[PDB]
Structures are given as C-alpha cells and as structure tokens.
Amino acid sequence: ESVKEFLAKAKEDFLKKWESPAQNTAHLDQFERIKTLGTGSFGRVMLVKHKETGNHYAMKILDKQKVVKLKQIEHTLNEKRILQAVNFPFLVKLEFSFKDNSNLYMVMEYVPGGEMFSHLRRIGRFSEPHARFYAAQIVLTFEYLHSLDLIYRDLKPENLLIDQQGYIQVTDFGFAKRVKGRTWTLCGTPEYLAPEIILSKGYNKAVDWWALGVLIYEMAAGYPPFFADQPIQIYEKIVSGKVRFPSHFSSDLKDLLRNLLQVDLTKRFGNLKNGVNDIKNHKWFATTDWIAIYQRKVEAPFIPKFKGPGDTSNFDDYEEEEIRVSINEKCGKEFSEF
Amino acid sequence: TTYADFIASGRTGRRNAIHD
Numbered sequence: 001e002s003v004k005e006f007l008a009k010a011k012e013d014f015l016k017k018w019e020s021p022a023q024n025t026a027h028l029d030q031f032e033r034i035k036t037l038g039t040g041s042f043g044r045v046m047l048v049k050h051k052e053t054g055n056h057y058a059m060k061i062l063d064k065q066k067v068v069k070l071k072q073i074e075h076t077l078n079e080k081r082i083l084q085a086v087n088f089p090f091l092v093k094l095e096f097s098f099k100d101n102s103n104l105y106m107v108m109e110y111v112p113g114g115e116m117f118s119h120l121r122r123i124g125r126f127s128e129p130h131a132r133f134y135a136a137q138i139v140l141t142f143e144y145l146h147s148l149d150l151i152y153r154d155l156k157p158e159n160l161l162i163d164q165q166g167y168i169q170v171t172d173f174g175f176a177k178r179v180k181g182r183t184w185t186l187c188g189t190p191e192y193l194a195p196e197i198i199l200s201k202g203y204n205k206a207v208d209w210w211a212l213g214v215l216i217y218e219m220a221a222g223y224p225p226f227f228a229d230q231p232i233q234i235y236e237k238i239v240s241g242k243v244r245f246p247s248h249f250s251s252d253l254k255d256l257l258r259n260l261l262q263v264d265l266t267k268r269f270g271n272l273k274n275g276v277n278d279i280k281n282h283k284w285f286a287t288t289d290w291i292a293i294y295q296r297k298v299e300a301p302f303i304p305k306f307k308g309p310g311d312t313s314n315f316d317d318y319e320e321e322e323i324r325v326s327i328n329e330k331c332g333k334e335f336s337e338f
Numbered sequence: 339t340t341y342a343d344f345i346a347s348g349r350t351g352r353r354n355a356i357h358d
C-alpha cells in the first residue's frame with residue numbers, strides 16, 4: 001500500500017509537468033563545450049560547463065533536419081516532454097532544454113562513471129550479485145515509468161550510465177512514449193526487441209520486461225541471448241525464442257530469465273495479474289532489499305574512478321565535429337513545442 | 339565457446355537503435 005501511495009503522489013507530480021512542459025530554459029552561449037561523450041543513431045552528447053555556475057552537464061545535440069529525415073519528429077517531442085516531467089533516483093535529470101535555427105538541445109546532469117556497456121565489455125561479465133544490483137534498479141525504474149503510462153523501449157547497456165556512487169542512471173528517452181493502449185512503432189535495438197515487435201503486432205509495456213530479460217542475460221553472460229552478424233539473423237533467433245544459458249548461470253537466474261524471455265504474453269513476468277511483484281518476489285531477488293535500493297543505501301559492487309569534476313576517462317574518445325548554427329531557421333513548425 | 343563466437347562477431351561494439 002505504501003508503494004501504491006508513493007506512485008500516486010509521483011503521478012500527480014508528473015502530470016503537472018506533462019501538461020505544462022518547461023521550454024526554452026537556457027541558451028547555447030551559456031555553456032562551454034568541452035568534449036564528446038557519446039554518439040547514437042540520432043544525436044551527439046557533449047560534456048559542457050555552465051559558465052555562470054561552473055557546473056558540468058551532458059548536452060545532447062540533435063540536428064533538426066536529421067531528425068526529420070529519420071522520421072523521428074514525434075519521438076523527439078516525446079523524448080523531451082517526458083524527460084522533463086519525470087523524477088526518480090535512477091533516471092537522469094534534465095536540467096535545461098532549448099533550440100536554435102539548426103539544433104535541439106537537452107542539457108542533462110553529467111553522469112561521470114561511463115556507460116555500463118564499456119565496463120561490461122572490458123570486465124567480460126558481471127557476477128550474479130553485481131548484475132542483480134543493477135537489475136533491481138531497472139525493475140524499480142520500470143515500475144515507476146509504467147505507472148505513469150510510459151513505455152521506455154530502448155533498454156541496453158549503451159543507454160545505462162554509472163554514477164559516482166556506482167548506481168545506474170537511465171538515459172535516452174528517444175523511444176519513450178505515453179500510451180494507454182497498444183502501440184505499433186518498429187523501434188528499439190535489434191538484440192533487445194521482443195518477438196511481438198519483430199512480428200509487427202501491436203504491443204505494450206511487456207516489451208520492456210522482455211528487454212530486462214535480455215539485459216540481465218547479457219550482464220551475467222557477457223554476451224546477449226540472441227546474437228549474430230546481421231539484425232535479420234538476430235530476429236530469426238528471437239522469434240524462435242529458444243534460449244541457451246551458460247552453465248555457470250544459477251538455477252534461480254535461469255528460471256527468472258525463462259519467465260522474462262517468454263514469447264507467450266499470457267505468461268511473461270511483468271505482464272501477469274501480479275504485475276511487477278512476480279519479479280520482485282522471484283527467488284533470484286530474495287536477497288534484494290527493494291526499499292534500501294531505492295534509498296541508495298546499498299553499497300555498490302564498484303565505484304568508478306573519478307580524477308576530477310570534468311574528467312571523462314570513463315568514456316571512449318570520439319571524433320569532434322563543429323557545431324554549426326545556420327542563419328536560417330530549419331523545421332520551425334515541426335518542433336514548435338520543443 | 340559461445341563467448342568466443344560473440345567476440346569474433348561483428349556486433350561487440352556499441353549498438354545504435356533501429357527505426358522505420
């Protein structure tokens with residue numbers, strides 16, 4: 001009942017911001033651009049320093065014309081409208097947003113510990129208690145997002161950042177959507193797509209729980225449950241749904257993953273009468289103190305190295321590119337509400 | 339080993355989204 005009432009208050013908070021979104025709350029000239037932290041299919045994210053406060057932030061830059069070509073206009077409006085409205089300990093905070101003639105800009109808190117992705121590839125795999133610590137945070141974050149009628153749709157290590165205390169921050173709300181019924185857009189990342197997305201069925205928040213199953217498998221194995229050299233091959237494996245587990249996977253871990261990586265929607269954990277509690281009460285999570293995790297009272301498995309305020313040593317290096325702002329406004333109508 | 343097959347595959351680097 002306490003979770004229920006917590007989520008009720010959170011929804012009140014969310015809806016006020018959802019209906020009256022923050023807009024135009026800084027300007028590009030207020031930030032010193034330092035270094036690129038990462039790129040994705042759509043945007044480039046740079047470390048910046050706010051001149052007036054000396055705070056460091058991570059600034060996502062989207063080229064409006066590219067957003068249009070890739071048919072991501074409504075998605076990008078979703079992304080900013082949702083991210084500015086949410087508030088949870090494992091969701092990256094949006095501090096400012098604004099636009100100019102050429103680009104859209106989302107200025108977030110800078111999460112300095114790097115992508116989960118880079119640590120996972122370098123170390124090889126996480127032990128089960130390590131993976132469980134991260135998994136617990138995703139479970140609570142999805143409980144929160146889904147209670148707001150939000151579907152996230154891009155869970156993967158590349159979109160999960162480690163903070164200074166070793167906790168997860170979820171970034172990249174590019175495919176997040178507020179929807180009460182089914183939805184139909186083919187989006188996500190190939191290794192993480194639920195079968196019903198691949199098969200062009202309408203789908204719902206159960207796809208996020210499937211993706212949690214992929215993430216837990218990849219964390220604990222060091223490779224995804226379905227991989228190949230090309231996406232088409234990956235899709236064939238996903239739809240067959242046959243999963244093989246490393247021999248070091250515990251009995252409890254295999255059982256959880258069989259229930260998350262479940263092609264039958266009437267059987268998939270997260271999607272049953274008991275909702276998220278089928279997951280929270282599973283044997284693999286028996287040692288998890290869900291409230292202590294929410295309160296960030298649990299000692300983390302590891303703490304990223306941190307040499308200073310603006311240090312970027314936990315991120316790969318990227319080729320830097322000039323931020324050019326055209327003297328003519330591009331796509332003004334399309335992004336009027338941003 | 340499956341690990342060795344993964345490491346020799348073309349998709350061990352950062353994976354971007356799909357669309358359309």
Ligand SMILES: Nc1ncnc2c1ncn2[C@@H]1O[C@H](COP(=O)(O)OP(=O)(O)OP(=O)(O)O)[C@@H](O)[C@H]1O
Pocket residue numbers: 037038039040041042043044045058060092108109110111112115154158159161171172173174353354355
């Ligand atoms: N708040 C942040 N702090 C530090 N680094 C970040 C932050 N947000 C994003 N990044 C880095 O920038 C990268 C790309 O950001 P993001 O995933 O939002 O862009 P994208 O174009 O939407 O990616 P995708 O192809 O996954 O849709 C991340 O993978 C991460 O390396």
Ligand SMILES: [Mg+2]
Pocket residue numbers: 040158159172
């Ligand atoms: Mg991303």
Ligand SMILES: [Mg+2]
Pocket residue numbers: 040041042154172173174175355
């Ligand atoms: Mg994205």
